[PDB]
């Protein structure tokens, strides 16, 4: 999160940290959302690599004991059958993870709320992005969860020449583009929370930013549109 601020310890309890084993430690690599006691939603491109993955819930500071963490292994990975690592611009950047154990729900660990199928947001809707990702283009991961105010940019505007052009599709959400605030590497797979009818729901899965840099004027952060994938998500959980 570029141009973010520190989120309160209990503001976004469905946020998780996806980490892989490295030697004798684990490294953070991506965010995700807890959507079931034993199921996580994240980005497909986050699990392209055949690593050993674990999930941490109730996490706030990556390199210090918070006293609230729960650590669970990933037992099965289901990526969207249409996803293509050589073509993120094509969409379908979404995956579901089954955990080896069911986690315990509390004030720091809660299920994310999903929008209803087909739901589209108005231009300039109020949303927040959260994550432990790079705080600067080519910078460093953050230690504590960050948040940034990121209002949507509707399809007709985001798909115009001065913005992303044909690179973005209707199965994506655009947010930001102000040159100051944005997603960045290591935020991917995490939630975009949007306020709808007085409740925060997860409308997006962080997918990509411009190759020119994370916070670039007229190049909003691009998210997978969750509301496009509700049937698939339900179908997967009911059969696994
Ligand atoms: Ca910690
Ligand atoms: Xe990103």
CATH number at residue 206: 2.40.10.10
- In whole angstroms, give the CA distance from residue 22 to residue 109: 26
Mark whether 130 and 214 lie in a shared domain: yes
Mark whether 185 and 140 lie in a shared domain: yes
| Of 166, 218, 172, residue with least CA distance to 192 | 172
Mark whether 168 and 67 lie in a shared domain: no
Mark whether 25 and 47 lie in a shared domain: yes
Counting the structural domains of the chain, the total is: 2
- In whole angstroms, give the CA distance from residue 152 to residue 175: 4
| Residue ranges in 77-159 assigned as alpha helix (H) | 155-158
Mark whether 4 and 122 lie in a shared domain: yes
Mark whether 120 and 76 lie in a shared domain: no
Mark whether 66 and 137 lie in a shared domain: no
Residues 86, 87, 93, 99: what is their CA dihedral angle, to the nearest 10 degrees?
Answer: -10
Mark whether 103 and 122 lie in a shared domain: no
- Chain-centre distance of CA 133, in angstroms? 11
- Whole-number Cα distances in Å, 172 to 18, 90, 175, 177, 226: 22, 10, 10, 15, 8
Mark whether 58 and 171 lie in a shared domain: no
Q: Is the shortest distance between the CB of 185 and ligand 2 below 6 Å?
A: yes
Residues 178, 95, 110, 183: what is their CA dihedral angle, to the nearest 10 degrees?
Answer: -20
Centre of ligand 2 to C-alpha 49, Å, is 17
For residue 168, give its domain range. Answer: 1-12+112-227
Q: What is the C-alpha end-to-end distance of the chain, expressed in Å? A: 33
Helices then strands, each counted (H, E), the chain: 2, 14
- In whole angstroms, give the CA distance from residue 95 to residue 101: 18
- Whole-number Cα distances in Å, 231 to 227, 234, 237, 238: 9, 5, 10, 11
Q: Is the shortest distance between the CB of 188 and ligand 2 below 6 Å?
A: yes
The catalytic residue positions are: 45, 93, 188
| Of 76, 72, 93, 94, residue with least CA distance to 19 | 72
Strand duo 5-6 + 146-149: pairing: antiparallel
Mark whether 116 and 77 lie in a shared domain: no
Burial 118-155 (b: 16+ CB within 10 A, else e): ebebeeebebbbbbbbbbebeeebbeebbbbebbbbeb
Centre of ligand 2 to C-alpha 210, Å, is 9
Q: Is the shortest distance between the CB of 206 and ligand 2 below 6 Å?
A: yes
- In whole angstroms, give the CA distance from residue 200 to residue 226: 14
Residue identified by tokens 């946020």 is: 15
Mark whether 116 and 221 lie in a shared domain: yes
Mark whether 140 and 202 lie in a shared domain: yes
């Amino acid at each position: 999160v570029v141009g973010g601020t520190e989120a309160q310890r209990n503001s976004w309890p469905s946020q998780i940290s996806l980490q892989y084993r490295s030697g004798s430690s684990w490294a953070h690599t991506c965010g995700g959302t807890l959507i079931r006691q034993n199921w996580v939603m994240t980005a497909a491109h986050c699990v392209d690599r055949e690593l050993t993955f674990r999930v941490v819930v109730g996490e706030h500071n990556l390199n210090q004991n918070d006293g609230t963490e729960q650590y669970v292994g990933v037992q099965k990975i289901v990526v969207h059958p249409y996803w293509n690592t050589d073509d993120v611009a094509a969409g379908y950047d979404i995956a579901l993870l089954r955990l080896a154990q069911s986690v315990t729900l509390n004030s720091y660990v809660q299920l994310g709320v999903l929008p209803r199928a087909g739901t589209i947001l108005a231009n300039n809707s109020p949303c927040y992005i959260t994550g432990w990702g790079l705080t600067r283009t080519n910078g460093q991961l953050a230690q504590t969860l960050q948040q940034a105010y990121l209002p949507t940019v509707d399809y007709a505007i985001c798909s115009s020449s001065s913005y992303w052009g044909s690179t973005v599709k209707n199965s994506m959400v655009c947010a930001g583009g102000d040159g100051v605030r944005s997603g960045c590497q290591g935020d991917s797979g995490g939630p975009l929370h949007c306020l709808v009818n007085g409740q925060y729901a997860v409308h997006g899965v962080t997918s990509f930013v411009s190759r020119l840099g994370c916070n670039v004027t007229r190049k909003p952060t691009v998210f997978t549109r969750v509301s496009a994938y509700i049937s698939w998500i339900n179908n997967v959980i009911a059969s696994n």
